[PDB]
């Protein structure tokens, strides 16, 4: 599993709602929900877009998307 605590923080800070984040990612909210709830793995392009959208530091990516619980 992946601990998305830090990621959820940036999403609230930058986008507000998960829905807003979904629109910014070009994804459906159900798609985003299933990924943030570790039911569906993140695609390669989705992570890169999340970095662009949330303006994350690329070096922090292991802590945002690859933190095992």
């Amino acid at each position: 599993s992946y601990d998305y605590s830090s990621l959820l923080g940036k999403i609230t800070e930058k986008c507000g709602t998960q829905y807003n984040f979904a629109i910014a990612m070009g994804l459906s909210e159900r798609t985003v929900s299933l990924k943030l709830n570790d039911k569906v793995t993140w695609k390669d392009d989705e992570i890169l877009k999340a970095v662009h959208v949330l303006e994350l530091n690329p070096q922090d990516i292991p802590k945002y998307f690859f933190n095992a619980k």
Partner: protein, 80 residues
């Protein structure tokens, strides 16, 4: 340099004198550990840039090669 996983794989293979079969052998304990499987054909596809590996397979190869996930995805970051 800002690239993709396909080039980073090739970079590792050249820098560490490894072939696809080597990487698979190293991943075997991590495949069992993370519950993420990786076949020879699917790894061949990643190298040949046929398909881009998802979060799971990135995690698998990163821990296997002992490198940063961000680096393995082509980001301009430290390798570890």
């Amino acid at each position: 340099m800002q690239t993709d996983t396909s080039n980073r794989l090739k970079q590792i293979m050249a820098e560490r004198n490894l072939k696809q079969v080597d990487i698979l052998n190293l991943s075997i304990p991590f495949q069992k550990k993370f519950g993420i499987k990786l076949s020879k054909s699917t790894l061949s596809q990643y190298v040949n840039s046929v398909q881009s590996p998802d979060q799971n397979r990135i995690y698998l190869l990163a821990k296997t090669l002992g490198v940063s996930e961000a680096w393995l995805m082509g980001f301009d970051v430290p390798m570890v």
